[PDB]
Short mmCIF file of C-alpha atoms in Angstrom, two decimals:
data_model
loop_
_atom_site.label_atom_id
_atom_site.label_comp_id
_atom_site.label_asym_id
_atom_site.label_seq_id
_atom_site.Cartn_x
_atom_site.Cartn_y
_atom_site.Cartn_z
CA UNK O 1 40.47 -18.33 95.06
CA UNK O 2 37.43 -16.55 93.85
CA UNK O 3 33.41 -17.43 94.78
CA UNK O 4 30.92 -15.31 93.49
CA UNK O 5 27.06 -16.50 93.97
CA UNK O 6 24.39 -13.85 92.33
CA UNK O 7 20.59 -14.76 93.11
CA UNK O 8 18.98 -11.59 92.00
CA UNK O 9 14.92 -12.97 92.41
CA UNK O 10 12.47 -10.22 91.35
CA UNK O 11 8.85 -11.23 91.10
CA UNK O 12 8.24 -6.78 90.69
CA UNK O 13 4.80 -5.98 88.94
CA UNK O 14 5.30 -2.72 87.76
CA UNK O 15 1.05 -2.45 86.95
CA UNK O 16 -1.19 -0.01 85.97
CA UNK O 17 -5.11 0.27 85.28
CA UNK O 18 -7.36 2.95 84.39
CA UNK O 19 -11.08 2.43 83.55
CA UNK O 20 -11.17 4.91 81.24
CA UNK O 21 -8.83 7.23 79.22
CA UNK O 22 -10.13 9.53 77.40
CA UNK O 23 -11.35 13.01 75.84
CA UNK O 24 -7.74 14.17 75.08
CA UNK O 25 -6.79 17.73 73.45
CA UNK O 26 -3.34 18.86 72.14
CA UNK O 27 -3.82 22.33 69.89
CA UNK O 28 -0.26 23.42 69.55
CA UNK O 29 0.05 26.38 67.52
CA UNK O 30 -3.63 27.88 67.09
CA UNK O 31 -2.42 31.30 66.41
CA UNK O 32 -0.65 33.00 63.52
CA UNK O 33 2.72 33.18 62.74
CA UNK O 34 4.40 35.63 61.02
CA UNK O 35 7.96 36.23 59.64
CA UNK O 36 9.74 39.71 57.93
CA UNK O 37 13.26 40.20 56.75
CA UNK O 38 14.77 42.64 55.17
CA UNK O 39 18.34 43.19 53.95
CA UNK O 40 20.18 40.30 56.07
CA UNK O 41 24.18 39.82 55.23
CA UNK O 42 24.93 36.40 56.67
CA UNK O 43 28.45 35.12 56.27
CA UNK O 44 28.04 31.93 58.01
CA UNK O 45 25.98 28.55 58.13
CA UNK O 46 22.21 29.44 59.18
CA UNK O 47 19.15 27.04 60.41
CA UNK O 48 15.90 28.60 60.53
CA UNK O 49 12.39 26.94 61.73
CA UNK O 50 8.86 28.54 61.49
CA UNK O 51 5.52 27.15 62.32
CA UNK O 52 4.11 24.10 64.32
CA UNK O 53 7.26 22.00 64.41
CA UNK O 54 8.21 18.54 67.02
CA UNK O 55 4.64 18.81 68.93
CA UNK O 56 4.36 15.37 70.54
CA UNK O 57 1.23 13.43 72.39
CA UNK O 58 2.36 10.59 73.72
CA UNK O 59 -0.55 8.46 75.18
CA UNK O 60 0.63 5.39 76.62
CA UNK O 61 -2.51 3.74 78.09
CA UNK O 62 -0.09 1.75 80.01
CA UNK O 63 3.44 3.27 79.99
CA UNK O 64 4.79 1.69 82.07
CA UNK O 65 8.28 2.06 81.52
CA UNK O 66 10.96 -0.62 83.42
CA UNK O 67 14.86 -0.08 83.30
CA UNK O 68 17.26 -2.75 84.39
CA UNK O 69 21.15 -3.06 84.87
CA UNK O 70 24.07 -5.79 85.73
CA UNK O 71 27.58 -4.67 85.42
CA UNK O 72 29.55 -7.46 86.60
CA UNK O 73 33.38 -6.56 86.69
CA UNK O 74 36.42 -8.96 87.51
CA UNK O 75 39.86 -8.06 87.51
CA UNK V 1 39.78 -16.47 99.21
CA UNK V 2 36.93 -14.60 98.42
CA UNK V 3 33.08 -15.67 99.05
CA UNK V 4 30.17 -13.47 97.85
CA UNK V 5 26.46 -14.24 98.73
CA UNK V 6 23.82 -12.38 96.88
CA UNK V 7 20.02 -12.31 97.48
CA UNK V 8 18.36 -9.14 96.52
CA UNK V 9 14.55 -10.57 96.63
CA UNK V 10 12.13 -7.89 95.77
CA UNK V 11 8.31 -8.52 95.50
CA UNK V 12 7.44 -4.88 95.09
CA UNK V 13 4.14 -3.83 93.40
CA UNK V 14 4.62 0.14 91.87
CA UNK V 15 1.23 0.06 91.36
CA UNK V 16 -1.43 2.84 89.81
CA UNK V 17 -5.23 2.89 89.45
CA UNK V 18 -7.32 5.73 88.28
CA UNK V 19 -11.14 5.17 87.66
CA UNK V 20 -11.39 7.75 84.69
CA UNK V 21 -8.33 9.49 83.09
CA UNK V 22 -9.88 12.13 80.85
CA UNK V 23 -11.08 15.84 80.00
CA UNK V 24 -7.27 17.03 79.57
CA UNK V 25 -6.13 19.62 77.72
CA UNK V 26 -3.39 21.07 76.15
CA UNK V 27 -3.67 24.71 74.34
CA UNK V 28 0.11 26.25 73.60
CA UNK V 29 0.81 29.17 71.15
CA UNK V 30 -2.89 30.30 71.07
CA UNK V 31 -1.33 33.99 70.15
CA UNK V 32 0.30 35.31 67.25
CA UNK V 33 3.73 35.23 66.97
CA UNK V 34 5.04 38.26 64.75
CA UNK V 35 8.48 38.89 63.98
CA UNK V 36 10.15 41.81 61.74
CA UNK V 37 14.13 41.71 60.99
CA UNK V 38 15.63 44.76 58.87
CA UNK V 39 19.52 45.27 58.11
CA UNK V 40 21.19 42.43 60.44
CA UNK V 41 24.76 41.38 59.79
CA UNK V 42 25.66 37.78 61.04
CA UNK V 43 28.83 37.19 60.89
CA UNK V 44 28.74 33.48 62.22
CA UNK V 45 26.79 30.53 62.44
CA UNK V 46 23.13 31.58 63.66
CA UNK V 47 20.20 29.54 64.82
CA UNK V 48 16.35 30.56 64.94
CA UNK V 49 13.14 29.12 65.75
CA UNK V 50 9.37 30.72 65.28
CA UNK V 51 6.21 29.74 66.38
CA UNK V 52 5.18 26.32 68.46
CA UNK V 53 7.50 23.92 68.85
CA UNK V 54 8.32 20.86 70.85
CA UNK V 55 5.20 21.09 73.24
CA UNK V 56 4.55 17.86 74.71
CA UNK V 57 1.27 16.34 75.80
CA UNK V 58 2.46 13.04 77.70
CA UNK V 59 -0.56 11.12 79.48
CA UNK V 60 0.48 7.78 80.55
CA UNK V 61 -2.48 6.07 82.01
CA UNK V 62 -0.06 4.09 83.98
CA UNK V 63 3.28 6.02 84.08
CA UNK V 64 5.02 3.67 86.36
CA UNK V 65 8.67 4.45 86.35
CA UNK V 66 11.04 2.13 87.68
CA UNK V 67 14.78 1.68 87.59
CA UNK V 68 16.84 -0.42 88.85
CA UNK V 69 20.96 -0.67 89.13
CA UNK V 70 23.59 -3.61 89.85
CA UNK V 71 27.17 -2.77 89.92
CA UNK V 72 29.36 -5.16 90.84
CA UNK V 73 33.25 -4.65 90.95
CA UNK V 74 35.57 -6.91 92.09
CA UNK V 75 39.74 -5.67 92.29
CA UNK E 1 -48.33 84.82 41.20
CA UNK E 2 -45.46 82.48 41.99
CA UNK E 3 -42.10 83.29 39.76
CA UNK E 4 -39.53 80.82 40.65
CA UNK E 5 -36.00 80.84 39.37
CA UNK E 6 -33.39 78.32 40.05
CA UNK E 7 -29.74 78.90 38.99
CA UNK E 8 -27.51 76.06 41.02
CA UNK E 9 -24.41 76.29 39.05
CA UNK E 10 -21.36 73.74 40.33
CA UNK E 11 -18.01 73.11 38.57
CA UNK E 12 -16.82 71.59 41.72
CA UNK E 13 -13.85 68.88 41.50
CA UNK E 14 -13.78 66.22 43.88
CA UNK E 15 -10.28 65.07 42.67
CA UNK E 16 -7.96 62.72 44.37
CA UNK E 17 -4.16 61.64 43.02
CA UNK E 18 -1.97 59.00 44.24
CA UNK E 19 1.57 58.22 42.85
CA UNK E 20 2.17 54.71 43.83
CA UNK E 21 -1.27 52.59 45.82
CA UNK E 22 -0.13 49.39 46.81
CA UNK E 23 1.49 46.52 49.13
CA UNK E 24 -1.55 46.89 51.12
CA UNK E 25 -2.71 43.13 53.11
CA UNK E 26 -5.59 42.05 54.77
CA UNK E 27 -5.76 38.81 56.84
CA UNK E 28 -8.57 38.47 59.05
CA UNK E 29 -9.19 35.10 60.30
CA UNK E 30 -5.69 33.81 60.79
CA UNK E 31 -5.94 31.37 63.68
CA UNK E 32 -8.27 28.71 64.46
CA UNK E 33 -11.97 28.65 65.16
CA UNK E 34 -13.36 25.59 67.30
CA UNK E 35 -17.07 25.41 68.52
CA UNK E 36 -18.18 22.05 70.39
CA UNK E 37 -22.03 21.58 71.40
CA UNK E 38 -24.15 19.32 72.99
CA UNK E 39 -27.32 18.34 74.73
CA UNK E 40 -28.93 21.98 73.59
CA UNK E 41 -32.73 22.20 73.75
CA UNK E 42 -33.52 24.82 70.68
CA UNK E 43 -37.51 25.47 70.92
CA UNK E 44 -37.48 28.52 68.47
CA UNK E 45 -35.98 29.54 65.08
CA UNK E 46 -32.16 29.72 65.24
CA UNK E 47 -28.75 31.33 63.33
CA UNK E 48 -25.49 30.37 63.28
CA UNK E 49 -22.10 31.35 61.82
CA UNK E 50 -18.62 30.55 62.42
CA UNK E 51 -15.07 31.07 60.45
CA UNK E 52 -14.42 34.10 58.31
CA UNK E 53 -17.25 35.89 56.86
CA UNK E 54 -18.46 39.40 55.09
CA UNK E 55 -14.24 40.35 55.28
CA UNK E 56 -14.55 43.59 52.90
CA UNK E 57 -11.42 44.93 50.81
CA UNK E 58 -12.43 48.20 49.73
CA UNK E 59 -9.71 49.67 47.58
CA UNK E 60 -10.77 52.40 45.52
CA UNK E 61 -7.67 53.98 43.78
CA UNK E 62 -9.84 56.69 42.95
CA UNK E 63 -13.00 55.94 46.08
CA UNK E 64 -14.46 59.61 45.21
CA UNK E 65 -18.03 59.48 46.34
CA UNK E 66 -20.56 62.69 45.59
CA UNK E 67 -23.87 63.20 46.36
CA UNK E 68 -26.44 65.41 45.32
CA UNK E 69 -30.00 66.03 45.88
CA UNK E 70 -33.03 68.96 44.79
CA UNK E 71 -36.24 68.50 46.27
CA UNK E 72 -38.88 71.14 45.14
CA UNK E 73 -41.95 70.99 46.44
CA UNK E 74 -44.61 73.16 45.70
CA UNK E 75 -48.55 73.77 47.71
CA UNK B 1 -46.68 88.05 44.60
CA UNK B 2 -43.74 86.04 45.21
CA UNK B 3 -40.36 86.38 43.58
CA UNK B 4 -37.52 84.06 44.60
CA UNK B 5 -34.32 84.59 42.86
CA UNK B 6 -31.65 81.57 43.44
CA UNK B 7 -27.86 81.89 42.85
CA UNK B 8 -25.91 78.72 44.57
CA UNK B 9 -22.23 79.09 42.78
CA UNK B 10 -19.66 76.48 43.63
CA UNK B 11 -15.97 76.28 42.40
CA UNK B 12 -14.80 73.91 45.30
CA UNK B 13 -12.07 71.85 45.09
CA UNK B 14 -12.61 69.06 47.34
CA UNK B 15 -8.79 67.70 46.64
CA UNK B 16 -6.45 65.50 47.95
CA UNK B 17 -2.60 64.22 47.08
CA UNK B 18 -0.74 61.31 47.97
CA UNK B 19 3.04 60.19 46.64
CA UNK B 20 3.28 56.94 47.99
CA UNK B 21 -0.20 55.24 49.43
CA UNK B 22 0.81 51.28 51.06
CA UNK B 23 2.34 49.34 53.20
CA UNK B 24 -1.20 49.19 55.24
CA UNK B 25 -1.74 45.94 57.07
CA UNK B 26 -4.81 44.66 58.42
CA UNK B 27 -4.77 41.42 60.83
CA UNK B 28 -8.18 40.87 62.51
CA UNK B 29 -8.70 37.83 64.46
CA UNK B 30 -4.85 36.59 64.94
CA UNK B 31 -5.37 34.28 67.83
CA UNK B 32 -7.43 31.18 68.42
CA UNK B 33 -11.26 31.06 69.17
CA UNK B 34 -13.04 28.26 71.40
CA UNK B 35 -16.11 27.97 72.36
CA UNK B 36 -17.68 24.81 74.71
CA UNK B 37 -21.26 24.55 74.86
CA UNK B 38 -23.28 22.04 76.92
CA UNK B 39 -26.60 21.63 78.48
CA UNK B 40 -28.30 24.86 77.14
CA UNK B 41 -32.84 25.04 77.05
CA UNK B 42 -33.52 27.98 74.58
CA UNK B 43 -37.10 28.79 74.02
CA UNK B 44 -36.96 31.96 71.94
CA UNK B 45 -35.08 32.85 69.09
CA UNK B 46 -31.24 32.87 68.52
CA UNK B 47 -28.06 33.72 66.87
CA UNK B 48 -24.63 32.95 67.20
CA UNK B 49 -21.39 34.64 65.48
CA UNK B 50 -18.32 33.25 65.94
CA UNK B 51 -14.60 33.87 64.43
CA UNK B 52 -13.46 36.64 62.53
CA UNK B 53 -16.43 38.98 60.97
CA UNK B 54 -17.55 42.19 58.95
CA UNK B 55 -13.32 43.15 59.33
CA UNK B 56 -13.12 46.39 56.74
CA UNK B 57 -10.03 47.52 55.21
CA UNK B 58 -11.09 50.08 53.46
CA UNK B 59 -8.01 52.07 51.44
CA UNK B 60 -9.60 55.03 48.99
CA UNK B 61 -6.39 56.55 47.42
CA UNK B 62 -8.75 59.61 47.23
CA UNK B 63 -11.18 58.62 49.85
CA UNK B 64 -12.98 62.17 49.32
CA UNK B 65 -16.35 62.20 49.94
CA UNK B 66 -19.06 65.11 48.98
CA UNK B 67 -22.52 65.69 50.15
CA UNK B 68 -25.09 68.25 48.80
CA UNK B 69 -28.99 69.10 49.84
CA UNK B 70 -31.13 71.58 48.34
CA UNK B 71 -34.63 71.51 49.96
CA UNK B 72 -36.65 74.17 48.57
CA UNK B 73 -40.43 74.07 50.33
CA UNK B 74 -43.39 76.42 49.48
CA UNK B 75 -46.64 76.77 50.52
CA UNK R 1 -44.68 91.32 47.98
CA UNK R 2 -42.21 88.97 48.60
CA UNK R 3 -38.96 89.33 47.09
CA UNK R 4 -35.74 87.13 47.72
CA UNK R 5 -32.20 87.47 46.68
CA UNK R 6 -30.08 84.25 46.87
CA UNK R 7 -26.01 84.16 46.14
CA UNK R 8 -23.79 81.52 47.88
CA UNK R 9 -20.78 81.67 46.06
CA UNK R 10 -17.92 79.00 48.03
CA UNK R 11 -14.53 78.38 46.12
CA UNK R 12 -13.60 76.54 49.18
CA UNK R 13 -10.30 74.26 48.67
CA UNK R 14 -10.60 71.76 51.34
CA UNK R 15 -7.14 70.47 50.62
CA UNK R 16 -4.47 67.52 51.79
CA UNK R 17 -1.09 66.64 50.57
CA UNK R 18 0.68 63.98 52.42
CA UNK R 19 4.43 63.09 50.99
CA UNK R 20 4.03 59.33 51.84
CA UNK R 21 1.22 57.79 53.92
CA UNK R 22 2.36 54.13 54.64
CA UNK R 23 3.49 51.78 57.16
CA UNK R 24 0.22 51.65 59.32
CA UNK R 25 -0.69 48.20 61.15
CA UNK R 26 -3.76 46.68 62.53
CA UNK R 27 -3.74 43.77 64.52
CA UNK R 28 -6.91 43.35 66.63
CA UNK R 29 -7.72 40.29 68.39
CA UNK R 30 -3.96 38.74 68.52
CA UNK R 31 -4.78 37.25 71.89
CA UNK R 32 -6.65 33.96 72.50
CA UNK R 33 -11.23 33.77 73.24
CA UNK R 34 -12.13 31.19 74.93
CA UNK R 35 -15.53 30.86 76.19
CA UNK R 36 -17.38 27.91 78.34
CA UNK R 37 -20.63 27.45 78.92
CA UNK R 38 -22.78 25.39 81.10
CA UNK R 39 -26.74 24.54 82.29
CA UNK R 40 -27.82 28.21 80.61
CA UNK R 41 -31.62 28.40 80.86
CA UNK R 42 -32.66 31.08 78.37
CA UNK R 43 -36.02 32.14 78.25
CA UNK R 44 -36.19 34.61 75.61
CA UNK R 45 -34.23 35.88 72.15
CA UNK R 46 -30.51 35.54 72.35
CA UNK R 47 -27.92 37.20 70.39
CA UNK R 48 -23.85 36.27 71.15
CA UNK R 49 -20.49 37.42 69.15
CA UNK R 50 -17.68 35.45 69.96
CA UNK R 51 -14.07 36.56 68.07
CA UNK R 52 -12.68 39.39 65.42
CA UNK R 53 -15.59 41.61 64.63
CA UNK R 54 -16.45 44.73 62.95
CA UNK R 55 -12.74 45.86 63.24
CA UNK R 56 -12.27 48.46 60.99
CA UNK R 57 -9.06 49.83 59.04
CA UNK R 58 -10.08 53.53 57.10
CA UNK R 59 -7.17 54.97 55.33
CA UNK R 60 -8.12 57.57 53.01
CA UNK R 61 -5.64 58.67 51.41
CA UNK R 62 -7.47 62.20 50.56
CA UNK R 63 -10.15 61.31 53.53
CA UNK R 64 -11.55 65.16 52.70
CA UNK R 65 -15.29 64.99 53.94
CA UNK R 66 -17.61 68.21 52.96
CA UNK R 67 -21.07 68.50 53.97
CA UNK R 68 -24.30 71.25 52.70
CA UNK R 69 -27.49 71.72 53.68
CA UNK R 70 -29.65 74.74 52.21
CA UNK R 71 -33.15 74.20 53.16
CA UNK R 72 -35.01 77.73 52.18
CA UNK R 73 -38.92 77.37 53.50
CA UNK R 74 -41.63 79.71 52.55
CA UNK R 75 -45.04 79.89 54.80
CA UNK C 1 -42.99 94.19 51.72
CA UNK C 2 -40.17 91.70 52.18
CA UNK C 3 -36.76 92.65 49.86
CA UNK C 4 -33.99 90.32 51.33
CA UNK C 5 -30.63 90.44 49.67
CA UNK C 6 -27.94 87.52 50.10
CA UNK C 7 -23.65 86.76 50.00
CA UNK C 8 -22.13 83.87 51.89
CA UNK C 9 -18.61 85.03 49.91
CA UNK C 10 -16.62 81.83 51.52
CA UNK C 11 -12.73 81.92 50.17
CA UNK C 12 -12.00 79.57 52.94
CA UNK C 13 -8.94 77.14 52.56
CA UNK C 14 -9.19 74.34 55.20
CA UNK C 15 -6.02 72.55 54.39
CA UNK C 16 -3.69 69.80 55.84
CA UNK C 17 0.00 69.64 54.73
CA UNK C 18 2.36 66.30 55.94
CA UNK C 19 5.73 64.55 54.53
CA UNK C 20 5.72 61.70 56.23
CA UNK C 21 2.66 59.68 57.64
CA UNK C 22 3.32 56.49 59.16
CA UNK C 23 5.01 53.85 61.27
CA UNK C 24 1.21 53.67 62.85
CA UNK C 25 0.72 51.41 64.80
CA UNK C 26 -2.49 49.44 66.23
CA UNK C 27 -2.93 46.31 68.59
CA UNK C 28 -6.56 46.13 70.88
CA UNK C 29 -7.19 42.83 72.45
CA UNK C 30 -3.34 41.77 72.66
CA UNK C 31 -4.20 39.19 75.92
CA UNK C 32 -5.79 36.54 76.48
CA UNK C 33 -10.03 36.71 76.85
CA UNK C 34 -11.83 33.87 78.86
CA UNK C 35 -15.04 33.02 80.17
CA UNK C 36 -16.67 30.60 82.35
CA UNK C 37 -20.51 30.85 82.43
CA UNK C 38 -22.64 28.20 84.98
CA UNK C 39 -26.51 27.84 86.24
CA UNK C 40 -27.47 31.52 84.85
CA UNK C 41 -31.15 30.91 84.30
CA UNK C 42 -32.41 33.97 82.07
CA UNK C 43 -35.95 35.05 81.38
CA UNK C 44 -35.52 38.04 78.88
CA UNK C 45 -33.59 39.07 75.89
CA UNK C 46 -29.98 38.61 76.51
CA UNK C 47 -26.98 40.55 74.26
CA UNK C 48 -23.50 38.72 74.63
CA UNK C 49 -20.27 40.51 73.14
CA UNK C 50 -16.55 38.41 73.83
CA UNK C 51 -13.33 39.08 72.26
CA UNK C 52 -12.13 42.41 70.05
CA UNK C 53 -14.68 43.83 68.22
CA UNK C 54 -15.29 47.37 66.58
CA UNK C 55 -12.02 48.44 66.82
CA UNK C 56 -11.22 51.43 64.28
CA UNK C 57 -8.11 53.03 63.05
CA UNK C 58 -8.73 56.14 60.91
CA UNK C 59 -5.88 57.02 59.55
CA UNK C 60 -6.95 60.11 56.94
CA UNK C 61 -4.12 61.65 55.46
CA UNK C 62 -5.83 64.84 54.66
CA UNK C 63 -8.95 63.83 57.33
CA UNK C 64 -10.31 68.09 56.71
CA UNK C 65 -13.81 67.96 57.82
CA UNK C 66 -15.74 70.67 56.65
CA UNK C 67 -19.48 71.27 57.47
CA UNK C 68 -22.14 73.71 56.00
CA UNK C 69 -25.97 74.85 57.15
CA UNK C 70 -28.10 77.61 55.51
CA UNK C 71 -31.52 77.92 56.80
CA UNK C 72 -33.95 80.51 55.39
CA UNK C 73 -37.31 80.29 57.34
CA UNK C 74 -39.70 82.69 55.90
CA UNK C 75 -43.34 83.50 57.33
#
């Protein structure tokens, strides 16, 4: 026979405290872009991109971020 | 037989204080991007990208990362 | 006596020729400008500019300047 | 007496050819400008410029210039 | 007596001939300014430039400059 | 007496031949400028200059200076 006793107790304070945030900047892609093209043979499937493109500020004034896993297997 | 006893007990405090989160800055691609293509033969899937792209600014006033795992396999 | 004679004869041909003038750019002022002030004590007259300003084009398809000048003075 | 005999004779061919005049570019001022003031006590006059200024493209498809004095004093 | 005898003759041909004049670039100021300033005590006129100025681009095609002076003083 | 007889006979062909002028090429003030400025306590004029500035490019396709004096001083 098979017993199997699980008492995982968490009482975990994943905490975080700032008094202030503040006076934030993010200036992706001040400058100038420029693109030339001239006599192109393509003979396949193209992607192209060009300018100020995925530019992310995250500003979690927590972020606190918590990841938990139970794999219980029986065979 | 088989007897499993399990106590993982965990009190534990990830913890994070700042008095002032500020005065941050983030300045990418301040400079000109130039780019000139003449007489180019692709012959197969191409990819391009120009300029700024994918420039993160994370500020998590906490940022408290925790993870945490429970495998459990029994044969 | 004074006799004064005055023979300035000119058949002089400032001459300018151009087949094709053209695919000419001009882009001043591409990026960004960004000015941020504070707490300033001004206790006299003041000037300011910022961005793009007096950007000249000149394009003269002819641009053929002369000049001339007769002073005659007589005591 | 005085006799003054004056003979300036000019024929001359201030010229100039082009076939193909372009393809000029002009790109003042590309990048990004900041400026961060704080805590300044003038007490005289000012001025400020910022940015992209008093950029010139000039392009005279001639582009001939003449100049010509004739100062002719007596006493 | 006085008597004065005065022939310039000038069938000067100050000539160009360019095929094709093309292709020229100007990039000035491609790069980034940034400027930061702090507790200045000024006591007297200011002048500043920050940025692109004054950046120039002459492209005479011709660009055929001719200069004359005849100053002829009697006493 | 005063007989004086003159002939400037100038002929003089300052010329400039080219086939092909171009693929010039101009880039001042490619980096990065910065400046950090603390406590300066000034008691005179002050002149500030940052970044590219007065940047030329002649490019005169003919570009034949030619330059002429005639003085005649008589007493």
């Amino acid at each position: 026979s098979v017993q199997i006793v699980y008492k995982p107790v968490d009482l975990s304070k994943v905490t975080s405290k700032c008094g202030s945030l503040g006076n934030i900047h993010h200036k992706p892609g001040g400058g100038q872009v420029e693109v030339k093209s001239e006599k192109l043979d393509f003979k396949d499937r193209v992607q192209s991109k060009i300018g100020s493109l995925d530019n992310i500020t995250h500003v979690p004034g927590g972020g606190n971020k918590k990841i938990e896993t139970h794999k219980l297997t029986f065979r």
